Design an enzyme around this catalytic site. Structure first.
Site, short mmCIF file in Angstrom:
data_model
loop_
_atom_site.label_atom_id
_atom_site.label_comp_id
_atom_site.label_asym_id
_atom_site.label_seq_id
_atom_site.Cartn_x
_atom_site.Cartn_y
_atom_site.Cartn_z
N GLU A 1 -15.69 -40.71 -17.01
CA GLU A 1 -16.73 -41.68 -16.74
C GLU A 1 -16.30 -43.11 -17.03
OE1 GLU A 1 -19.41 -41.43 -15.30
OE2 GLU A 1 -20.57 -39.61 -15.78
N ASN B 1 -18.84 -46.09 -15.25
CA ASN B 1 -20.27 -46.34 -15.08
C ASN B 1 -21.00 -45.00 -15.13
OD1 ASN B 1 -22.91 -46.85 -14.03
ND2 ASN B 1 -22.14 -48.81 -13.26
N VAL C 1 -23.42 -44.19 -11.97
CA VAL C 1 -22.89 -44.15 -10.61
C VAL C 1 -21.75 -43.13 -10.57
CG1 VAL C 1 -21.78 -45.46 -8.77
CG2 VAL C 1 -23.45 -46.56 -10.26
N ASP D 1 -20.40 -34.80 -40.91
CA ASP D 1 -21.05 -35.09 -39.62
C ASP D 1 -20.05 -34.89 -38.48
OD1 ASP D 1 -22.89 -35.85 -37.73
OD2 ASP D 1 -22.81 -38.01 -38.23
N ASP E 1 -19.72 -54.12 -34.19
CA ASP E 1 -20.01 -52.81 -34.76
C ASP E 1 -20.28 -51.81 -33.64
OD1 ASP E 1 -20.60 -50.92 -36.84
OD2 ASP E 1 -22.32 -52.12 -37.55
N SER E 2 -20.33 -50.53 -34.00
CA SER E 2 -20.93 -49.52 -33.15
C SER E 2 -22.44 -49.47 -33.44
CB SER E 2 -20.23 -48.17 -33.33
OG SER E 2 -20.23 -47.74 -34.67
N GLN F 1 -26.56 -47.42 -32.08
CA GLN F 1 -27.27 -46.28 -31.49
C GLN F 1 -26.75 -46.01 -30.09
OE1 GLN F 1 -31.50 -46.53 -32.10
NE2 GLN F 1 -31.99 -44.83 -30.72
N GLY F 2 -26.49 -44.73 -29.80
CA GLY F 2 -25.95 -44.33 -28.52
C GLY F 2 -24.44 -44.21 -28.49
N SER G 1 -23.02 -42.88 -31.19
CA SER G 1 -22.95 -41.67 -32.00
C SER G 1 -22.06 -40.62 -31.36
CB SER G 1 -24.35 -41.05 -32.10
OG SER G 1 -25.18 -41.79 -32.96
N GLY G 2 -21.16 -40.06 -32.18
CA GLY G 2 -20.31 -38.98 -31.75
C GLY G 2 -19.02 -39.41 -31.09
#
Ligand SMILES: Nc1cc(CNC(=O)[C@@H]2CCCN2C(=O)[C@H](N)Cc2ccccc2)ccn1
Ligand SMILES: [Ca+2]
Length: 223
Positions: free
Chosen positions: A52, A54, A57, A84, A171-172, A174-175, A177-178
């Site tokens: 991936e 975009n 699309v 985690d 920073d990183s 929300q979203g 994550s992982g």
């Protein structure tokens, strides 16, 4: 990712998007059949999206593969986010190519001061909300354990490290994550948690992947 930059299509070929009708987390492809993500990303009905850029699309390099099994670390504690980490098995092997590639697991832990690459499709604002369509990247150094513990007193375990900037701004979020933290060509971290995003004296906290390599290897050898 707050304060980062547009990576460029497929320049992070181990980055995956986890999709349950919508993008909800990142992950890292570690071989043709397995993804590493955060345990706090667990849910049923995951489709892994490889290749991936975009995420809204179909650009022609994607592979969409359903998960056949997820394995949350046996010691994951959802209150403290200790341990985690989660493994996701693909229903069929990915076809590895220049745009879909695995990232090596570490053999040693990375050192404070090492510059790493963090990536994802998470929120790009430190105040407010804006979610990007193309993959974002951030270069950030690993911080000392003492600065990490001073930023988050009573909350940092030996299975976590901080990376980022005490001044804030990068920073990183929300979203993200992982998703991956890659240093010296190895997967050293997983986007885990922080107090807000890009706030002063509150850097990102990441799962310390080097502590889990034995568990990962034994688990994938038996599943
Ligand atoms: N560097 C980063 C990376 C992130 C990505 N991670 C999250 O967003 C996770 C997912 C669940 C919530 N969260 C938080 O980090 C909460 N702030 C604390 C919390 C944790 C868990 C449950 C409730 C609250 C966020 C911030 N800075
Ligand atoms: Ca796409």
């Amino acid at each position: 990712i707050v304060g980062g930059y547009t990576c460029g299509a497929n320049t992070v070929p181990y980055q995956v998007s986890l999709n349950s009708g919508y993008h909800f987390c990142g992950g890292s492809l570690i071989n043709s059949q397995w993804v590493v993500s955060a345990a706090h990303c667990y849910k049923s009905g995951i489709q892994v999206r490889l290749g991936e850029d975009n995420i809204n699309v179909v650009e022609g390099n994607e592979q969409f593969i359903s998960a056949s099994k997820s394995i949350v670390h046996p010691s994951y504690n959802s209150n403290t986010l200790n341990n985690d980490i989660m493994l996701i098995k693909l229903k069929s092997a990915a076809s590895l190519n220049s745009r879909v590639a695995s990232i090596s697991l570490p053999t040693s832990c990375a050192s404070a001061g090492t510059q790493c690459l963090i990536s994802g499709w998470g929120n790009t604002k430190s105040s407010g909300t804006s979610y990007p369509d193309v993959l974002k990247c951030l270069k950030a150094p690993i911080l000392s354990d003492s600065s990490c513990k001073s930023a988050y007193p009573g909350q940092i375990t030996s299975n976590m490290f901080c990376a980022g900037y005490l001044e804030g701004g990068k920073d990183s979020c929300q979203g993200d994550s992982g998703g991956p933290v890659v240093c010296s060509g190895k997967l050293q971290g997983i986007v885990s948690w922080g107090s807000g995003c890009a706030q002063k004296n509150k850097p990102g906290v990441y799962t310390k992947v080097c502590n889990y390599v034995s568990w990962i290897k034994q688990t994938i050898a038996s599943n």
